[PDB]
Design a protein around this ligand. Structure first.
Ligand SMILES: [Mg+2]
Ligand SMILES: [Mg+2]
Ligand SMILES: [Mg+2]
Ligand SMILES: [Mg+2]
Ligand SMILES: [Mg+2]
Ligand SMILES: [Mg+2]
Ligand SMILES: [Mg+2]
Ligand SMILES: [Mg+2]
Ligand SMILES: [Mg+2]
Ligand SMILES: [Mg+2]
Ligand SMILES: [Mg+2]
Ligand SMILES: [Mg+2]
Ligand SMILES: [Mg+2]
Ligand SMILES: [Mg+2]
Ligand SMILES: [Mg+2]
Ligand SMILES: [Mg+2]
Ligand SMILES: [Zn+2]
Lengths: 153, 49, 108, 115, 308, 217
RNA sequence: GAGCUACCUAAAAACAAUUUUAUGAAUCAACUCGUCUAUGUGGCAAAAUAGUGAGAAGAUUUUUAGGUAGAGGUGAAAAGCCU
């Protein structure tokens, strides 16, 4: 009975759900790497990317400026979003934020966690997953097949 | 010509900066008070130890 | 509604030892290549992740000291430099965070 | 959807019902297998301490596409023998009554307008 | 450790291999599909003539959605769109082994990925030489109308006019109350009804000291296989293999269905006029138009309907 | 470039192939019958054949109060009052028994819906049956009539004063006291206008559709 | 055992704005009360909560100390109260 309802139910209601995401987003737009429960971090991820879309539009656009105010509680971050975050992402058209699952919380609450960040941040690189090198047994065999097929092609 | 919002603390937030801005609001009423007797009343209407 | 009879330990032992109530074993545990501590395949390694976050706190603490105020976030790009490193020409006009320690291996 | 107790507008010229006084006539009975009565459905109407059969010519409920939805529930008073009580009907009457199963040609003759 | 491990196709593939593997599989599917594109030139089974009492095979189609349609009488008929996608006969059981009086054919459709299927299913499809299909279904087919396994099937199997029957799983609505599931009247909201508004009434009779089996009680609704009968075929789009079926068809949009010749008594012998085994475009007996319409249907681009 | 609203697909999980088929049928009809550009609030005259009558057509004139539907199911409702009796008819764009659609007056109104005219005075919805068409300038912006209607007594079919409707074409001040207006704002729901995931961006789709629509010509 | 409660003595306190007038009059807060419905029912509660209601310058409410004790006390009488 909640089929196609993209949104979650968080906070004390619809408005509260909007105000909790405004705080994670402002922390993200400020620190560029923020932690939260997997559910809430994933809920924001859509909102996080769309700010860059408005930032790309530019300062002059009235709609971008107005939106950047409701979604940035601290008012020292609107200049940053437009003048450093937006220039960085001009080349890209998507994939602004990187989300990964940090182990469960060691709090006695034991909630699922995730770390969300902005790509190209100055902070130390996250321990991302690494796929096996082409030299590994299985990988090397496939490469031999590719060479054979490329010759056949 | 980007009409950025002023970089000031929030009025209703529970923070020291937000508290200080609310204090300035109270002092504003004193500044714009028309008469001296009203000025004194606003200053001392609240009693603390 | 109240129980009409005491339930025997045999019936109780049938309900609480059912397969549906047991802990299902985890098959996705592995060994982190770098540190060797245990991790789930679809999750990051806490030991390695803790190193990154500990460095992040130190960098963020240094940033806080420099700014010295709530609304002092710089629009210009941020950058972190360690002892023995000097800003390049391409890095001109970028905020610099100074760290006493040497450049960590994971940090590039 | 005309049902029991509905106040209805007698769009006619009959002296008994067309005169503008007394409470709006209320529906007592709907001559359908279902309670809801739509355009072209007979209904029993109570007027001034009397029971008079009427005919629905329009209603406020949305209908099928290309059909006229009126802003008020309109009805026409019909004698027991089928002859309409009123001699004229000036407000437009929908033309679907012609092909609906039943006897409506008499009303169409009385109704000058057509929508 | 010395224990069972969990793995998937991507776990080991490297960056370069990841794209190559996702590309090599795509190349193989095209080649396999092309190999079966010519049924009649691949040792087809004998094509016996039609006689009274014959039952044909049926297709499995994807439910794209609905759209309006008009007839030359001016009436609008809500019609649904069903797309045939990679509908290939898979297996042919004989009369005796099938356990029925009639033989049975399996008709799969809607090719799917190969990376998340059990090894047994992949092996069966590899022998058949076709890409795996999302769903299997069984059609009761007389011996005369048998088709060789691996024969591709297309929307030309049907023609405008023929009444057809469609069956598929209904939309799953989850655990629901007695009111919504079975349309129970329920209890009034006011006048003193205390905590009883949507609950079932009296389960059963008191004296029997039990509840009759099959009683209507709260439970999961939907997600149950259901069939709709006597649905006319308004139009057939050869290019996109889309059949226009009157009214509503069970299932959600993009849900696979089982289209089949209607079993109603009036439609007992409607298969005679249509292709008896099936239509083979590779045969190229006749080149059909892109869109096939019924006589009553008002085709677009025709003059506006006038009720003279 | 005026793209008819029905062409733009609604979001969902439906495959594009369903829309492509519908557009092809729709474009074919447009060749036979031209659907003139019109917006909510324009006065239209529609000629449709009557199945009940024998070889006879009918015309209805009214202001277009609502545009709804997608694809071949697109519909529009045009309203008028005859002999003091208000009438509304919902018309299907591509119904094969429509002979002609005429835009008597091409104009736009402050609101995307004119349903509130039911609660307005009769004059604001009355239109002459035989009113002649006005000249139109293609190389112009569609005229935006900013008339604010006057309402009848307070009990309305809907609570138009409420923020959800967002009506900008009613003279609330004459009909409603300031205290009532403040009460309506308790249902404002201000957050909705600022959630970036409620926005359906059709920039690429509108560009893609226009080329294909123009390509058919 | 009258620190609850019925009653009384003494010493005290509270009552905005509005309209009447010159008041056991009116609208309505603080405050007092407890008509109705709903929830609760080992409850937040051994009588509450959410709404809705009655009075609100008076036979008014409240505070402090004291007095009346069981064959009794008190009672604008419900055989009501007296831990
Ligand atoms: Mg559901
Ligand atoms: Mg979901
Ligand atoms: Mg404080
Ligand atoms: Mg009910
Ligand atoms: Mg209830
Ligand atoms: Mg809708
Ligand atoms: Mg209503
Ligand atoms: Mg005392
Ligand atoms: Mg007393
Ligand atoms: Mg007073
Ligand atoms: Mg009392
Ligand atoms: Mg009162
Ligand atoms: Mg009184
Ligand atoms: Mg008084
Ligand atoms: Mg008594
Ligand atoms: Mg006691
Ligand atoms: Zn590790």
């Amino acid at each position: 009975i909640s089929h196609g309802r993209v949104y979650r139910r968080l906070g004390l209601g619809p408005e509260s759900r909007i105000h909790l995401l405004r705080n994670l987003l402002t922390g993200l737009v400020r620190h560029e790497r923020i932690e939260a429960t997997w559910a809430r971090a994933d809920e924001m991820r859509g909102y996080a990317e769309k700010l860059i879309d408005y930032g790309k539009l530019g300062d002059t656009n009235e709609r971008a400026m107005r939106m950047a105010d409701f979604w940035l509680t601290e008012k020292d971050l609107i200049p940053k979003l437009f003048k450093v975050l937006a220039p960085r992402f001009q080349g890209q058209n998507g994939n602004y934020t990187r989300m990964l699952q940090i182990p469960n919380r060691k709090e006695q609450d034991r909630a699922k966690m995730a770390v969300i960040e902005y790509k190209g941040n100055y902070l130390p690189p996250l321990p991302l997953p690494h796929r096996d090198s082409n030299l590994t047994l299985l990988n090397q065999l496939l490469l031999g097949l590719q060479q054979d097929l490329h010759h056949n092609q | 010509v980007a009409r950025y919002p002023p970089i000031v603390a929030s009025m209703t937030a529970d923070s020291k900066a937000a508290r200080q801005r609310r204090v300035q609001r109270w002092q504003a009423t004193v500044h714009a008070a028309p008469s001296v007797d009203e000025k004194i009343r606003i200053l001392t209407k609240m009693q603390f130890k | 509604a109240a129980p009409k009879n005491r339930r025997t330990i045999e019936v109780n032992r049938c309900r609480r030892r059912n397969p549906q109530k047991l802990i299902k074993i985890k098959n996705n545990i592995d060994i982190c290549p770098e540190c060797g501590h245990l991790k789930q395949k679809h999750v990051l390694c806490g030991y390695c992740y803790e190193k990154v976050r500990q460095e992040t706190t130190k960098i963020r603490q240094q940033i806080g000291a420099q700014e010295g105020g709530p609304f002092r976030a710089p629009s210009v790009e941020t950058m972190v430099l360690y002892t023995g490193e000097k800003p390049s020409e391409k890095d001109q006009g970028k905020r610099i965070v100074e760290r006493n320690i040497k450049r960590p291996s994971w940090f590039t | 959807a005309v049902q029991k107790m509905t106040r209805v507008r007698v769009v006619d010229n009959s002296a008994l019902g067309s005169t503008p006084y007394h409470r709006p006539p209320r529906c007592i009975h709907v001559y359908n297998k279902s309670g809801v009565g739509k355009v072209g459905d007979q209904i029993l109407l109570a007027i001034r301490g009397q029971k008079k059969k009427a005919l629905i010519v329009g209603h406020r409920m949305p209908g099928s596409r290309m059909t006229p939805k009126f802003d008020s529930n309109n009805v026409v008073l019909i004698e027991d023998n089928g002859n309409p009580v009123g001699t004229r009907i000036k407000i437009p009457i929908p033309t679907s009554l012609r092909r609906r199963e039943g006897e409506y040609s008499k009303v169409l003759a009385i109704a000058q307008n057509f929508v | 450790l010395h224990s069972k491990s969990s793995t998937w196709w991507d776990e080991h593939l490297s960056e370069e291999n990841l794209s190559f593997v996702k590309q090599l599989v795509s190349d193989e599917n095209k080649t396999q599909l092309t190999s079966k594109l010519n049924p009649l030139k691949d040792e087809p089974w004998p094509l016996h003539p039609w006689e009274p009492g014959s039952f044909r095979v049926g297709l499995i189609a994807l439910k794209l959605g609905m759209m309006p349609l008009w007839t030359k009488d001016g009436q609008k008929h809500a019609v649904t769109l069903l797309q045939v996608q990679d509908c290939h006969v898979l297996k042919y059981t004989p009369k005796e082994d099938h356990n029925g009086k009639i033989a049975a054919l399996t008709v799969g459709g809607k090719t799917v990925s190969r990376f998340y299927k059990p090894d047994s299913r992949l092996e069966f499809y590899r022998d058949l030489g076709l890409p795996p299909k999302q769903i299997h279904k069984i059609f009761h087919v007389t011996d005369n109308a048998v088709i060789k396994p691996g024969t591709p099937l297309y929307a030309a199997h049907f023609r405008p006019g023929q009444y057809v029957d469609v069956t598929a799983k209904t939309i799953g609505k989850g655990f629901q109350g007695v009111m919504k599931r079975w349309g129970f009247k329920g209890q009034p909201a006011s006048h003193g009804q205390t905590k009883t508004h949507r609950r079932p009434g009296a389960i059963s009779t008191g004296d029997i000291a039990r509840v009759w089996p099959g009683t209507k009680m709260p439970g999961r609704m939907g997600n149950q296989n259901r069939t709709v009968y006597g649905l006319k075929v308004w139009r057939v789009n050869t290019k996109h293999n889309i059949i226009y079926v009157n009214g509503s068809v069970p299932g959600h949009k993009n849900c696979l269905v089982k289209i089949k010749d209607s079993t109603l008594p009036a439609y007992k012998d409607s298969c005679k006029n249509l292709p008896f085994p099936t239509y083979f475009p590779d045969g190229d007996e006749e080149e059909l138009p892109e869109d096939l319409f019924d006589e009553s249907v008002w085709q677009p681009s025709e003059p506006s309907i006038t009720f003279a | 470039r005026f793209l008819s609203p029905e062409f733009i697909p609604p979001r969902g999980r439906t495959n594009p192939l369903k829309f492509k088929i519908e557009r092809k049928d729709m474009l074919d009809r447009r060749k036979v019958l031209p659907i003139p550009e019109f917006y909510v609030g324009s006065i239209l005259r529609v000629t449709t054949a009557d199945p009940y009558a024998s070889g006879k057509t009918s015309q209805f004139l009214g202001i277009c109060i609502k545009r709804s539907g997608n694809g071949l199911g697109a519909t529009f409702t045009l309203r008028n009052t005859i002999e003091g009796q208000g009438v509304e008819i919902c018309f299907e764009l591509y119904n094969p028994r429509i002979q002609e659609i005429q835009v008597v007056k091409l104009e736009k109104r402050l609101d995307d819906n004119l349903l509130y005219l039911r609660d307005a005075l009769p004059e604001y919805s009355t239109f002459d049956v035989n009113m002649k068409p006005v000249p139109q300038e293609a190389c112009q912006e569609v005229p935006v009539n900013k008339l604010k209607v006057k309402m009848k007594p307070k009990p309305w079919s809907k609570r138009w004063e409420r923020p959800n409707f967002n009506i900008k074409g009613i003279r609330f001040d004459l009909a409603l006291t300031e205290e009532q207006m403040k009460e309506a704002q308790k249902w404002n729901k201000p957050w909705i206008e600022f959630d970036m995931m409620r926005e359906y961006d059709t920039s690429k789709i509108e560009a893609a559709l226009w080329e294909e629509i123009e390509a058919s010509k």
